């Protein structure tokens, strides 16, 4: 994934927080996934506003947080690839 | 840590020149007699 | 409320900067040149890097071969030169500098 | 003697395109200056195009030989 | 231009992998996965 | 208590995964994205380029 | 010779027989701050270093133009002056 | 600053400003 | 300018020898939005029919609890809504936005059954329907239109400008540029026409081979990137699904 976080201003992302939920399509099969808007808003605390790209519609996160996120993704992916993975995240 | 207290840059230059001259003498000693004398004294002269 | 302001397109669509190229290294040119000196095979004019070409250019500039000739040698090439003749004619608008050129050669 | 041989080869490979562009060009220019009719001009256009292709071929050859002559291991 | 092409390929081949957080030769420095055992 | 803390950290893991999925699905196509903008966003691959193309020339 | 000023190296064949030869890194990285970048994974560049780097996202055609004009002026009117006839 | 304490290695490579000295050194032919 | 759009389709175009034609209009002219950089006053205006939208608006306002807005907008819009013509958002785009931002299936189905498939929502409609600012809605519509810039936009027609000065300068250009033997030179006939004609013929004969040989690498890279993205997303999703049932331990305890 890229470090491009869409601006939640209505001129860019119309209707961001009008409802308490976000939805996304995942993969080639386009599975649906719903995510709480608070879980999402947790990103805009690490978002950095000095940086703006792609027609000034996307900000960038701080590398610390972005790489923590990438590491969680990578851990999940390698666990999926492996077979001795733990049956729980506890 | 550049430089040392009590030592002079001129002393450093002297030491470096000594090293260079010693290395040159060593390299001239460990060389072919057929080529070194010629290339170092007769062509230059 | 209604919109009455005349919204320009520059407040919406921002153009990319393409006039001056990008610097993916995020380092200035003189620092690149300095770094290349300590890399193997890129010292000053040795090698075939851009820094080598730049240093060779500066070296031939620092040399004498491309400097103007002295007065003792002007009449070897310069006084019979197309650039010299054209410049003399241009800066003497309505005159003929052949005689003055002969006298400059004599001098 | 090897230095002289090498410089001769290098200069020849460097001037090859200049020759193809200048002397054959002078020949073409002579022909253009002398020819007036339309049939001969129609036939000579193809000679000009062939000269284009030949110039590009000479440039390729020179590029090859020059990358061979200016390649250093260290 | 060489640098430009290199970065242009790095983009496509790295930015959407999920497996290259960094370079594999430096994976020893990454933290350890709590899910493996 | 300890069970609550373990559930909390596992939920943090899964929330970070969901955030990653959201970021990925909201990202623009990387071939549409500008190369220099991508490299400015990424700080790790900057060091990879500087190592092989700023500290060397060959 | 004594041996103090001996050659500070060993032939590559003897190194290969010893199992000591290394071949790589036509370049180098002087400072550990620069060596450990690809291994840190979290702060390859400090904050101050990032802010300094953000100033070189593009090359400065303005500086190029200014320096080139200055150098051309100097080279033409101080270093490349030649005489001209006067009538 | 004195000649000796200036040309001392430590002070010469750490605290001193050798800019003018090395500029004079480079331009020596001009002055001569 | 940036390349906007959420599509991964590597798209190239081939050109014809015919120009784009639009219906005749005595006051409007069609142009590219990025090449024109138009403003709100440069955009052309027209009147749109209200009722089909006013019904849905009355419903939404009775649901949300704001009828003053409906009354004001209806009194403004009677006799048709006068609005810029090519500043709109399509029903599909709006539905995608609603879905990804969390509007319920009931509301989405209401939208679908209420409006036709080819309906075009404008920024005043969007603003009055979502309690937003017409400025922000205008900017959003402009971005969504620039995302699809192949479609020309309709501006007000303006007469040409500076024709007399342009005529003077073009006369000067010809007077200084054709008073020569350039187009009759041996250099021309030997280098300029042969090289140029050969390049043109080779380009016309291998127009597509060249393009394909150049675009091969970019196509492969885009394919690789998309495959990696898909596989990673799927793996992460299925693993989180596996670990989804690790919260009930507490409520069991
Ligand atoms: C009258 C009769 C005349 C006959 C001769 C009589 C005897 C006179 C003396 C001999 C004179 C000839 C010198 C030949 C030496 C080179 C050729 C050779 O065969 O050497 C082989 C000989 C044996 O080498 P080897 O067996 O193959 O391997 C062992 C290594 O050499 C072992 O290496 P190492 O581990 O011991 O140390 C590394 C070594 C590396 O040596 C090498 O291996 C190769 C050296 C490269 C040579 C060519 C470099 C050219 C670079 C281009 C310059 C571009 C500058 C651009 C600047 C731009 C900035 C504006 O370091 C050096 O010695 C080189 C230093 C100078 C390089 C300067 C380049 C610029 C860098 C500046 C650095 C800062 C200044 C130094 C500060 C030091 C602290 C004070 O080499 C040496 O012994 C040491 C290298 C030579 C050092 C110079 C010695 C002093 C020479 C004085 C010349 C003055 C002559 C004028 C006299 C007055 C007349 C009026
Ligand atoms: C009176 C006392 C004695 C005289 C001294 C006069 C004053 C100079 C004092 C010494 C220097 C200044 C000292 C105080 C500096 C204080 C400020 C500071 O710290 O930072 C600097 C200050 C700020 O630095 P910064 O904070 O890091 O930010 C910088 C900006 O971000 C911007 O960073 P950037 O990455 O964007 O870089 C911009 C760059 C943009 O990047 C480029 O350079 C691309 C273009 C390169 C062109 C090809 C380069 C060829 C180089 C040949 C050099 C030798 C030529 C011979 C010299 C005479 C030439 C007529 O543009 C340039 O600035 C370089 C211009 C190079 C000169 C142009 C020569 C003509 C080129 C012709 C090409 C066309 C040929 C066809 C002609 C036919 C036309 C129809 O900016 C500068 O002054 C830059 C220094 C420029 C030096 C030249 C660049 C290095 C090139 C090395 C070439 C080899 C030279 C070898 C040296 C001698 C041997 C050891
Ligand atoms: C060994 C391995 C390789 C190492 C590579 C190192 C790389 C760095 C190399 C340095 C870069 C410059 C080299 C350029 C190529 C050399 C030829 C050249 O370009 O100039 C031609 C030029 C002659 O060409 P020309 O065809 O006759 O044209 C005449 C025109 O008037 C032309 O003159 P002009 O009217 O146009 O005026 C300008 C001219 C006029 O220049 C002059 O006026 C010469 C007299 C200036 C005196 C100023 C006062 C200095 C006070 C003494 C300072 C202490 C010096 C200590 C020894 C030198 C230390 C490096 O000078 C120049 O054109 C620029 C050259 C000077 C640039 C500064 C370079 C300094 C050397 C830096 C080297 C640093 C690293 C070395 C490596 C170390 C190895 C580890 O050179 C000279 O005029 C004479 C050179 C001075 C020789 C005098 C000493 C002879 C030795 C016997 C003296 C008796 C006592 C010594 C006994 C020994 C004790 C045991
Ligand atoms: C050192 C030795 C050398 C020294 C000598 C130097 C000699 C220089 C000569 C002066 C000419 C300089 C070159 C520029 C020429 C003008 C080009 C131009 O603008 O045309 C485009 C002009 C604009 O139309 P467009 O580009 O298609 O669309 C824009 C709109 O028109 C919209 O346009 P706009 O809104 O921007 O402006 C409209 C303006 C356009 O009318 C014009 O064509 C402008 C002509 C103004 C010429 C002023 C010359 C000033 C220098 C000489 C000083 C003379 C003392 C008078 C001082 C001025 C106070 C009265 O007027 C009108 O169209 C009608 C409404 C009238 C409103 C009031 C206009 C007057 C304003 C107050 C004066 C402002 C003075 C500014 C201060 C200047 C300080 C340096 O249309 C024309 O082409 C007009 C006709 C062309 C003029 C020539 C007519 C044929 C007569 C040929 C002469 C005879 C053949 C030669 C033989 C002579 C034997 C003696
Ligand atoms: C003048 C034109 C020059 C332009 C081209 C050259 C490049 C321009 C930059 C300057 C060139 C010189 C750089 C020298 C760098 C070395 C610094 C250094 O510390 O080296 C280690 C030496 C040795 O140090 P040391 O061993 O005594 O003590 C320190 C020990 N360590 C390093 C472990 C901490 O230090 C010095 O003493 C300074 C030497 C440099 C000063 C001399 C300049 C050399 C150039 C002249 C060569 C001829 C020498 C004979 C001169 C006789 C004069 C009458
Ligand atoms: C802008 C200019 C840029 C260009 C750079 C300009 C400056 C640098 C230019 C250097 C390039 C040229 C370097 C060539 C050097 C070749 C000279 C050489 O190596 O000699 C040949 C000999 C040849 O040795 P060899 O024959 O055994 O082996 C040579 C190589 N093979 C094996 C292939 C044959 O080299 C030496 O062995 C000695 C070299 C070091 C000595 C240099 C001369 C000074 C000697 C002073 C000591 C005198 C002691 C006397 C004691 C008497 C009693 C015992
Ligand atoms: C197609 C094949 C073309 C090949 C032609 C390439 C020619 C390359 C040869 C030029 C380099 C030769 C090195 C000469 C060094 C001589 C020994 C030496 O160190 O003398 C230093 C001496 C400086 O001394 P001073 O003038 O007194 O300095 C005064 C300072 N004010 O160096 C010089 O004179 C410089 C010599 C200039 C060489 C002539 C320049 C020719 C221009 C070549 C560039 C054009 C492109 C060439 C094709 C590229 C081929 C790779
Ligand atoms: C805005 C200020 C910027 C600061 C710039 C300061 C740079 C000063 C450096 C000047 C050095 C010029 O060096 C000088 O160049 C001129 C050429 O023009 C040469 O001039 C030489 O050739 C010319 C023409 O044949 C003759 O007048 C004569 O034979 C001789 O003077 C000199 O031999 C050289 O010594
Ligand atoms: C970025 C870091 C830079 C650090 C290095 C700084 C370099 C400082 C030295 C450069 C300043 C100019 O250097 C000096 O210029 C003049 C003019 O060209 C030269 O002077 C030479 O040419 C002039 C003009 O013909 C003569 O009057 C003079 O007799 C002759 O020596 C000097 O030989 C040179 O030493």
UniProtKB/TrEMBL annotation, chain B:
User: In terms of the whole protein, what range is present?
Assistant: 9 to 53 of 157
> In which organism is this protein found?
Toxoplasma gondii (strain ATCC 50853 / GT1)
Name assigned to this protein: Uncharacterized protein
Automatic annotation (TrEMBL), chain E:
Output the superkingdom of the source species. Eukaryota
Listed name of the protein: Microprotein domain-containing protein
The record lists the organism as Toxoplasma gondii (strain ATCC 50853 / GT1)
Q: Which residues of the full protein are shown?
A: 155 to 191 of 205
Automatic annotation (TrEMBL), chain G:
**Superkingdom in the source lineage:** Eukaryota
Cellular localisation: Mitochondrion inner membrane
Q: Which family does it belong to?
A: Belongs to the cytochrome c family.
For this entry, the protein name equals: Cytochrome c1, heme protein
Q: Which residues of the full protein are shown?
A: 68 to 154 of 398
Automatic annotation (TrEMBL), chain H:
- Tell me the protein's name: Putative membrane protein
Which species is this UniProt entry from? Toxoplasma gondii (strain ATCC 50853 / GT1)
Upper lineage? Eukaryota, Sar, Alveolata, Apicomplexa, Conoidasida
Tell which residues of the whole protein are contained here.
33 to 64 of 128
């Amino acid at each position: 994934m890229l470090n491009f976080i869409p601006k939640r201003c209505p001129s860019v992302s119309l209707l961001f927080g009008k409802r308490p939920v976000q939805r996304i399509e995942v993969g080639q099969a386009r599975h649906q996934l719903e995510i709480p808007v608070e879980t999402i808003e947790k990103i805009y605390e690490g978002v950095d506003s000095r940086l703006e790209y792609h027609n000034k519609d996307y900000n960038a996160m701080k590398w610390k947080d972005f790489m923590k996120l990438k590491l969680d993704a990578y851990h999940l992916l390698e666990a999926s690839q492996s077979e001795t993975a733990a049956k729980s995240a506890l | 840590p550049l430089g040392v207290k009590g030592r002079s840059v001129f002393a450093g230059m002297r030491s470096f020149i000594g090293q260079r001259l010693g290395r040159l003498y060593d390299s001239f000693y460990y060389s072919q007699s057929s080529t070194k004398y010629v290339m170092v004294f007769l062509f230059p002269a | 409320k209604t919109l009455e302001r005349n919204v320009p397109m520059k407040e919406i669509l921002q153009p990319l900067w393409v006039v001056e190229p990008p610097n993916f290294l995020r380092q200035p040119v003189w620092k690149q040149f300095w770094e290349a000196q300590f890399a193997n095979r890129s010292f000053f004019f040795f090698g075939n890097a851009w820094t080598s070409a730049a240093a060779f250019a500066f070296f031939i500039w620092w040399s004498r071969v491309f400097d103007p000739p002295p007065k003792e040698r002007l009449d070897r090439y310069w006084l019979n030169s197309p650039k010299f003749r054209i410049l003399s004619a241009f800066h003497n608008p309505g005159k003929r500098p052949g005689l003055k050129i002969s006298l400059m050669t004599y001098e | 003697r090897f230095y002289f041989m090498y410089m001769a080869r290098t200069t020849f490979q460097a001037v090859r395109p200049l020759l193809a562009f200048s002397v054959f060009g002078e020949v073409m220019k002579l022909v253009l200056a002398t020819m007036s009719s339309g049939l001969f001009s129609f036939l000579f256009s193809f000679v000009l195009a062939f000269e284009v292709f030949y110039f590009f071929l000479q440039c390729y050859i020179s590029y090859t030989f020059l990358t061979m002559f200016f390649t250093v291991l260290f | 231009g060489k640098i430009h092409g290199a970065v242009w390929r790095m983009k496509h081949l790295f930015a959407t992998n999920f497996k290259m957080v960094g370079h594999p030769r430096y994976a020893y420095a990454l933290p350890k996965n709590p899910l493996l055992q | 208590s300890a069970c609550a803390k373990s559930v909390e950290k596992s939920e943090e893991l899964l929330s970070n995964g969901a955030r990653a999925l959201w970021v990925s699905c909201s990202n623009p196509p990387v071939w549409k994205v500008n190369t220099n903008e991508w490299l400015d966003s990424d700080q790790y691959w900057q060091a990879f380029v500087e190592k092989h193309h700023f500290y060397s020339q060959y | 010779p004594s041996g103090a000023y001996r050659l500070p190296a060993v032939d590559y064949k003897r190194q290969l027989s010893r199992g000591t030869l290394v071949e790589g890194a036509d370049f180098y990285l002087p400072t550990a701050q620069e060596q450990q970048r690809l291994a840190r994974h979290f702060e390859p560049y400090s904050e101050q270093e990032q802010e300094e780097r953000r100033k070189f996202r593009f090359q400065s055609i303005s500086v190029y133009l200014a320096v080139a004009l200055g150098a051309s002026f100097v080279h033409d009117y101080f270093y490349q002056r030649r005489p001209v006839a006067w009538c | 600053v004195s000649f000796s304490q200036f040309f001392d290695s430590e002070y010469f490579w750490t605290k001193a400003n050798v800019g003018p000295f090395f500029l004079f050194l480079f331009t020596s032919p001009f002055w001569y | 300018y940036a390349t906007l759009g959420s599509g991964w389709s590597f798209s190239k175009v081939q050109y014809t020898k015919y120009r784009i034609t639009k219906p005749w209009t005595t006051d409007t002219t069609f142009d590219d939005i990025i090449l024109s950089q138009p403003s709100k006053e440069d955009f052309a205006k027209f009147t749109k029919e209200a009722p089909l939208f006013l019904r849905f608006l009355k419903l939404v306002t009775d649901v949300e609890g704001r009828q003053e807005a409906f009354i004001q907008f209806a009194k403004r819009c009677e006799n048709g809504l006068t609005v810029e013509k090519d500043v709109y958002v399509t029903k599909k785009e709006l539905v995608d936005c609603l879905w990804k931002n969390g509007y319920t299936d009931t509301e989405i189905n209401a939208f679908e059954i209420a409006f036709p498939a080819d309906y075009k929502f404008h920024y005043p409609e969007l603003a009055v329907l979502f309690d937003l600012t017409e400025e922000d809605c205008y900017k959003y519509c402009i971005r969504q239109r620039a995302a699809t810039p192949e479609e020309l936009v309709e501006l007000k027609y303006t007469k040409p400008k500076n024709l007399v000065s342009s005529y003077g300068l073009c006369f000067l250009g010809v007077w200084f540029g054709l008073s020569n033997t350039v187009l009759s030179n041996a250099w021309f006939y030997s280098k300029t026409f042969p090289f140029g004609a050969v390049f043109y013929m080779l380009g016309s004969y291998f127009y597509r081979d060249i393009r394909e040989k150049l675009w091969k690498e970019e196509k492969s890279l885009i394919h690789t990137a998309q495959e990696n993205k898909n596989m990673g997303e799927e793996s992460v999703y299925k693993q989180m699904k596996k670990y989804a049932t690790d919260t009930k331990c507490l409520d069991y305890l």
